[PDB]
Amino acid sequence: LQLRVNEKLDVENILKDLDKYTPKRRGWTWRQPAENLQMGPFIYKDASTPLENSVALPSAKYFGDIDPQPLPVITTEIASGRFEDDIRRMRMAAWHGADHIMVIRTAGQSHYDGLIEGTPQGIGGVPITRKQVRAQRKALDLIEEEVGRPINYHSYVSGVAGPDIAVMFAEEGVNGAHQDPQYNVLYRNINMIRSFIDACESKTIMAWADMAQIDGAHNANATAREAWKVMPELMVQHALNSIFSLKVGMKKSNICLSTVPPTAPPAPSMYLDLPYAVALREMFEGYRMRAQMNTKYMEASTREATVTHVLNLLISKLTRADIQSTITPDEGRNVPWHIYNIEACDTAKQALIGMDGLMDMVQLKREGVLGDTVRELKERAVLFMEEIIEAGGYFNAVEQGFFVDSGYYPERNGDGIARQINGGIGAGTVFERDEDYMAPVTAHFGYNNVKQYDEALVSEPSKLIDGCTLEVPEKIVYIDELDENDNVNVRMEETKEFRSMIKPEVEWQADGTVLLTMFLPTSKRVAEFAAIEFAKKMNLEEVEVINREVMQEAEGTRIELKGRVPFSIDINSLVIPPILSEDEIREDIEKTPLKIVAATVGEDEHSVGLREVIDIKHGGIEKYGVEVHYLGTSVPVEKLVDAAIELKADAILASTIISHDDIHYKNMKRIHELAVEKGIRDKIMIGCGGTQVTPEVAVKQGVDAGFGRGSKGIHVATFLVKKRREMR
Amino acid sequence: DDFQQRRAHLANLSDEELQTRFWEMAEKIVDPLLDLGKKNTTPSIERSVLLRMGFSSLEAKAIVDKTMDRGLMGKGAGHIVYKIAKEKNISVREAGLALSEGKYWDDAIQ
Ligand code: B12
Ligand SMILES: Cc1ncc(COP(=O)(O)O)c(/C=N/CCC[C@H](N)C(=O)O)c1O
Ligand SMILES: CC1O[C@@H](n2cnc3c(N)ncnc32)[C@H](O)[C@H]1O
């Protein structure tokens, strides 16, 4: 119901009636290619359908504010701990091109042995529950209607309640999710038997939902000592979750490889990452490539991150990315702020658009060093499999510590992670099914004896109970809150005040945080602290130095700080006032020709100033088609006029630089008088400028306008067209 | 490399053959795991059955907690509730519900 572009999203109105919300859509959506698309002056080889409402790249202003959208579906990561604040950032992000909103879970939700309910406060992520999901997806339904292009809701089916969360996601129309039982074992230490048995069930459910699945390979990048050696392992994990998923019954087009280029500068990164990128995509023809951005070799400089992320988009463009995830360029500096999600989204939309149809003009030298390494990596991958097989399959491989090893396989440093086939979270929670094991629900995986109740229902185990929740949404049990203190409505009230005052925020409504960039003429430690003092003396609470870059050990250091603004401001308490374009100026002079005489006047030899507002170089009136007749310098006032008359000029421009004894105003006045004496004063425009000129003091002398320090041609031209109209 | 002498038996494969191998060995590795999946269940898998049947998360947990107390998992926590309702002539929900509060397990054991 509704949504207006100028009216804030009503979250309070969204938290309402949740017990009767259903999704509008089920499944993942891709972007529609829009072949040979025309937008503004240009034609686009690699664009998809444009949005109905969006915010263009700043510089789009020079091209009619077109906002073309790239082929790959674009992700951003929004999860602040409070979903209700996050929804607003979603709206923001969606207008900047995002159609994939991914919600990292609350710290170690992987360990929760079942669903959670309600809206407790997250920690390093949002606690995923049916309430919070219904809220966000309801909101996104709205937002996607607004932007005009379906949005993909995404989160994590991981840990010990995989099956649980898979069901909830399926029901509540979650469009994408991470699922990789390998993740559970390697990094979360969850019993390998328990989790690979669970995955079948989860993946089967996600299959039912036509959900896009992303895997966990990228976590290998992160754990690895040197990510440039982890590629043969990377190709095995990807391979393992893919065949496994495929076999469970997922579509090859829903199985997505999560693939981050391993290195970043100063390493020769394109050189290292490109051949692996090419190998990966050759081996998994048919599968989806989910390109994600580097976070390992990232620091606190947002600039650094942006450049390296561009090289990440280049990698995707030289090869393929069905999905292109993004990393906020401040990910290494703090928890993502609103503004840096939008930075990410702009960057990705920006580079890709800039790389439009680039493969029509560039191609891979597949036969050369590139080809050779591509084969080499595939072979190291194959060997890796052989050795797994050769030691009793997956489980023994993990036990023997094949995984997370800092060596470049077949090289083995013997420092990998090893898991007990019998240890871990949920050890000995695996039960054998008997001849008569049954489950009367849709999308169940393993042995299900229904024949003991009806040979004819074997393909419809839900018919045993007149449909399961997957067929009868009504049957789903909605739970609203469990904790009366740690919830959203308790949170929405600690801030209802700000819904007509205002203050700056970074993640959560009114949190008062802002960023401070400065440079100090001393070394890094001294400057780090001086920075904090300045920040303090600005009225900032909770001051942190978040970035430190050395300009030069001795000449100075850049510092970046966050802090808190302890006050608010009343919108009502601000006084806010309420412009001819270069095209308007140009058009007016094009239609009505406009002729000027200009001079540096008197005994003045300073010529630069007048010429600075005439020459086309720095935006002088010449640019707009004004006919400038220039007399030179040390021109007499009497002379200037006589020419204005001879040439039937429309305006006189005079430069007045030397200002000794008010000689500059004195000549301004002699010009007005000289024109009056000659009866052209009412038929002419008289403009005068100079270093010591004050526009008011110059009008008082009788001339039409005065210009001083900082005059540019646009100003003088705006004055010539406006004043001329005013006289007709 | 080392690597060089280990890839010896790979040198003469074609790119198609090397890929085909990779994948058939991939399938060979996960097939056993897939099996474990067919032949076994877990607390989460059972709770997830209950969720799909009309029960809540809190309820599902209680029903499975008592299903494990009786080594009954082997039958299927969803199954139990079913037989239990088709036996007493009651609603899938009332049965399941009853079981969540330690009722009808006497019956369940037979
Ligand atoms: C470089 C310079 C000179 C150059 C001039 C070279 C040339 N061809 O232009 C030479 C030629 C090196 C020079 C000579 C002298 N000059 Co001298 N000159 C300067 C200096 C440093 C340059 C100013 C300048 O060009 N600014 C850059 C331009 C871009 O700015 P602008 O002129 O102000 O123009 C802007 C605005 O005024 C406006 N504008 C200006 N005119 C007009 C007209 C119109 C219609 C509009 C719309 C806008 C507009 O638009 C521009 C937008 O940014 C200044 C000191 C200073 N910083 O002001 C003195 C200075 C103006 N000159 C000075 C002096 C004393 C001299 C000399 C007498 C020194 C000597 N010989 O002993 C001689 C005199 C020569 C003479 N017969 O006039 C003094 C003047 C003191 C005063 N108040 O009268 C100054 C202020 C230096 C000083 N403080 O002593 N100098
Ligand atoms: C396959 C999988 N399951 C669960 C979890 C996390 O869930 P918990 O923390 O164990 O509760 C992860 C973690 N990925 C880290 C960031 C995501 C990244 N930035 C991204 O590109 O996807 C995971 O990879
Ligand atoms: C620490 C927490 O325990 C849960 N939780 C489960 N049951 C209750 C209950 N009866 N009262 C309060 N919290 C409960 C939450 O979902 C949570 O935030």
Number of helices and strands (H, E) in chain A?
21, 24
Do the chains contact at A470 and B52, CB–CB below 8 Å? yes
CA A74/CA A89 separation, integer angstroms? 15
Domains A500-572 and A579-728 share a fold: no
Percent helix / strand / coil, chain A, rounded to 5: 40, 15, 45
CATH T-level topology, domain A500-572? Defensin A-like (3.30.30)
Q: Is the dihedral of CA A492, A151, A312, A284 positive or negative?
A: positive
A259: which strand partners?
A291
Instruction: Report residue A404 as tokens.
Output: 């997370």
Non-local (6+) Cβ contacts of A455 within 8 A are none
Residue nearest to atom 23 of ligand 2 (CA): A216
Q: Is A519 helix (H, G, I), strand (E, B) or coil?
A: strand
DSSP letter string over A84-110?
A: HHHHHHHHHHHHTT--EEE-PBSTTGG
Q: Which uninterrupted H or E stretch holds A259?
A: strand A255-259
8 Å CB contact between A723 and A705: yes
8 Å CB contact between A218 and A390: no
Alpha-carbon separation of residue A46 from A74, A321, A352 (angstroms): 15, 13, 9
Q: CATH top-level class for B1-40?
A: special
Q: Which uninterrupted H or E stretch holds A77?
A: strand A76-77
Instruction: Report residue A94 as tokens.
Output: 């969606």
Residue nearest to atom 1 of ligand 3 (CA): A483
- The letter for the amino acid at A82 is R
Residue nearest to atom 10 of ligand 3 (CA): A482
8 Å CB contact between B68 and B45: no
CA A431/CA A603 separation, integer angstroms? 104
Do the chains contact at A239 and B82, CB–CB below 8 Å? no
8 Å CB contact between B45 and A114: no
CA A319/CA A364 separation, integer angstroms? 9
CA B53/CA A57 separation, integer angstroms? 49
Atom from ligand 3 closest to the CA of residue A120 = 18
- Determined by X-ray
- The letter for the amino acid at A122 is G
Which ligand is nearest to the Cα of residue A483, counting in written order? 3
Non-local (6+) Cβ contacts of A526 within 8 A are A520
CA A496/CA A511 separation, integer angstroms? 13
Chain B nearest-CA residue for A408: B3
- The letter for the amino acid at B94 is E
User: Considering only CA atoms, which of A590, A612, A591 is closest in space to residue A600?
Assistant: A612
Q: Is A572 helix (H, G, I), strand (E, B) or coil?
A: helix
Alpha-helical runs (H) found in A615-712: 637-646, 663-677, 695-699
> Using N-to-C axis directions, what is the helix angle for A231-248 and A369-389, rounded to 10°?
60
Instruction: Report residue B83 as tokens.
Output: 């037989």
Instruction: Report residue B60 as tokens.
Output: 């599902």
CA A316/CA A80 separation, integer angstroms? 28
User: Considering only CA atoms, which of A244, A256, A170, A157 is closest in space to residue A214?
Assistant: A256
8 Å CB contact between A596 and A564: no
Q: Is A317 helix (H, G, I), strand (E, B) or coil?
A: helix
- The letter for the amino acid at A529 is F
CA A144/CA A167 separation, integer angstroms? 24
CA A377/CA A387 separation, integer angstroms? 16
Resolution, angstroms, 1 dp: 2.8
CA A449/CA A458 separation, integer angstroms? 8
Q: Count of alpha carbons within 13 Å of A500, Cβ hemisphere only? A: 5
A564: which strand partners?
A513, A541
Q: Which uninterrupted H or E stretch holds B45?
A: helix B43-51
8 Å CB contact between A204 and A249: yes
DSSP letter string over A115-151?
A: -B-S-PPPSSSB--BHHHHHHHHHHHHHHHHHHTS--
Alpha-carbon separation of residue A143 from A137, A206, A399 (angstroms): 10, 24, 47
A613 CA to centre of own chain: 41
Q: Count of alpha carbons within 13 Å of A120, Cβ hemisphere only? A: 14
- The letter for the amino acid at A350 is Q
> Using N-to-C axis directions, what is the helix angle for A338-354 and A83-95, rounded to 10°?
30
CA A715/CA A693 separation, integer angstroms? 15
Instruction: Report residue A346 as tokens.
Output: 């702009």
Non-local (6+) Cβ contacts of A240 within 8 A are A182, A394, B26, B29, B30
Å between B104 CA and nearest CA of chain A:
18
Residues of chain B in contact with residue A194, where contact means CB-CB under 8 angstroms, are 42
Q: Which uninterrupted H or E stretch holds A609?
A: helix A608-611
CA A317/CA B93 separation, integer angstroms? 54
CA A353/CA A338 separation, integer angstroms? 23
- The letter for the amino acid at B107 is D
Non-local (6+) Cβ contacts of A710 within 8 A are none
CA B52/CA A476 separation, integer angstroms? 7
Domain boundaries, chain A: 15-427, 449-499, 500-572, 579-728
Non-local (6+) Cβ contacts of A254 within 8 A are A28, A207, A210, A211, A212, A213, A288
Angle B56-A443-A119 from CA coordinates, rounded to 5°? 35
CA A665/CA A618 separation, integer angstroms? 26
Non-local (6+) Cβ contacts of A296 within 8 A are A221, A222, A227, A260, A262, A264
Do the chains contact at B7 and A379, CB–CB below 8 Å? yes
Instruction: Report residue A491 as tokens.
Output: 């949170």
Which is it for strands A323-324 and A73-74: parallel, antiparallel or unpaired? parallel
Alpha-helical runs (H) found in A430-580: 488-493, 524-536
Torsion of CA B7, B9, B14, B20, to 10 degrees: -90
Burial of A542 (0-12, 13-18, 19+ CB in 10 A): exposed
Could you identify the residue written with the tokens 């993942």?
A28
Q: Count of alpha carbons within 13 Å of A256, Cβ hemisphere only? A: 30
CATH T-level topology, domain A579-728? Rossmann fold (3.40.50)
Do the chains contact at B57 and A411, CB–CB below 8 Å? no
- The CATH superfamily label for domain B41-110 reads Ornithine 4,5 aminomutase S component, alpha subunit-like (1.10.8.1000)
Residues comprising chain B, all counted: 110
CA A449/CA A77 separation, integer angstroms? 43
8 Å CB contact between A263 and A297: yes
Instruction: Report residue B29 as tokens.
Output: 């590795």
Instruction: Report residue A607 as tokens.
Output: 């010529």
Picking from A380, A438, A445, the nearest residue to B37 by CB comes out as A445
Q: Is A464 helix (H, G, I), strand (E, B) or coil?
A: helix
Q: CATH top-level class for A15-427?
A: alpha beta
Q: Is A38 helix (H, G, I), strand (E, B) or coil?
A: strand
Residue B34 CB neighbour total at 10 angstroms: 19
CA A686/CA A653 separation, integer angstroms? 6
